[PDB]
């Protein structure tokens, strides 16, 4: 019932969600209670193999991966989904015996919905984690901005900018490629503005600093000022980055 979270999942999961409704209308307006619902062992077993596979890979994933929230959260998907099949198999079985079986129809619904749900969660976790990596990056930058307040010479400036400039490009890459992913325009926007807003203080940050580094090395007057047009820049940059972080973490 909510919009699907990114367009990769949407593509995957909507086609199913839809059809599961189609079934539901069907059930509850008179008449799968007409015929036959033919021997369905085969379609199911189809379904079972696929899920068995899915688990295969989830389990593979769990046992690799550094992310311990991943480790915790993915297992139950496996059940939700594993259990779901149980309900499908039974429905099959029930139908093989009695085509007019009414609880089979409920079972079928509820299996599918189960599988949707499992798979949904399963995908939501891997993605939550996929977002968490990005975050780690941003935090990395955030920390470095911190370190601008000690760059005190030409040597260190160059050194400093040698790393900042690229760290930025990596974050930039992924925010952008991340924003194209989302299904909410306001969030897509928010991100991009907040990243463009940063793309562009980068050189301000530079010059801000250059100046501090110039005036410190000239032993003269309004260090005082550079010092603040500089720190502010880090305050905007930072403030914005936490905003990006914020947005990434939304429904």
């Amino acid at each position: 019932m909510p919009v699907f979270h990114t367009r990769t999942i949407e593509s995957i999961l909507e086609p199913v969600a839809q059809q599961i409704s189609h079934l539901v209308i069907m059930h509850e307006e008179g008449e799968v209670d007409g015929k036959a619902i033919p021997d369905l062992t085969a379609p199911v077993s189809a379904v079972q193999a696929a899920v068995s596979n899915l688990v295969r890979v989830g389990k593979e994933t769990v046992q690799t991966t550094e992310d311990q929230i991943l480790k915790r959260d993915m297992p139950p998907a496996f059940i939700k989904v594993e259990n779901a099949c149980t309900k499908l198999v039974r429905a099959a079985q029930m139908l093989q015996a009695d085509p007019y079986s009414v609880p089979a129809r409920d079972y079928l619904i509820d299996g599918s919905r189960g599988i949707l749900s499992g798979t949904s969660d399963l995908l939501l976790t891997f993605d939550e984690a996929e977002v968490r990596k990005i975050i780690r990056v941003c935090k990395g930058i955030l920390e470095y901005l911190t370190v601008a307040e000690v760059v005190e010479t030409m040597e260190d400036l160059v050194t400093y900018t040698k790393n900042l400039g690229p760290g930025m490009t990596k974050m930039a890459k992924m925010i952008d490629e991340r924003q194209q992913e989302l299904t909410h325009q306001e969030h897509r926007v928010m991100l991009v503005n907040s990243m463009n807003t940063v793309k562009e203080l980068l050189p301000v940050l530079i010059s801000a600093m250059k100046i501090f580094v110039t005036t410190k090395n000239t032993k003269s007057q309004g260090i005082e000022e550079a010092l603040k047009n500089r720190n502010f820049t880090v305050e905007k940059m930072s403030a914005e980055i936490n905003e990006i972080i914020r947005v990434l973490q939304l429904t």
């Binding site: 999942i9 079934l23 379609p43 379904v47 696929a50 890979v57 499908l88 079928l108 798979t119 399963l122």
Partner: peptide, 23 residues
């Protein structure tokens, strides 16, 4: 990564093909 999604997309058709197949 996309392999995970790879399999989840299958399960979907598994299902759809199934819910199909009742009619």
């Amino acid at each position: 990564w996309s392999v995970l999604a790879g399999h989840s997309r299958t399960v979907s058709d598994s299902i759809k093909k199934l819910i199909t197949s009742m009619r």
